Design a protein around this ligand. Sequence first.
Ligand SMILES: [Mg+2]
Length: 102
Amino acid sequence: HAKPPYSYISLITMAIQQAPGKMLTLSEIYQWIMDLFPYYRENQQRWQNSIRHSLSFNDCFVKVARSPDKPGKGSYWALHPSSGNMFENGCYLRRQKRFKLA
DNA sequence: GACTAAGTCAACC
DNA sequence: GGTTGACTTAGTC
Ligand SMILES: [Mg+2]
């Protein structure tokens, strides 16, 4: 296929938002992206590292530790509540200012 | 075409 | 897996 019309930032945000808990683990971020965008069924070690970079680099995704083991392995990732509706209203490729913190 | 957000590669933790 | 950074790629005005 051709590449979906969304940035990883957009992708990760749709994945978190649809989450029943509004937070996912890395692997669950990967699974959503693959369940819906067959394009991402390929080239995995390239884009999966780029998802990790996004999650760490971007202030709009903060991690939320697990507690009582649950399944276990891997933190949870959620959206900073002060992110606004950023990749929202028709701009999924380039944000008009990336959410940086202070 | 600039300006700066986004994606790559890759070491380290 | 989660951070970092140096550097490239690319959307948008
Ligand atoms: Mg982050």
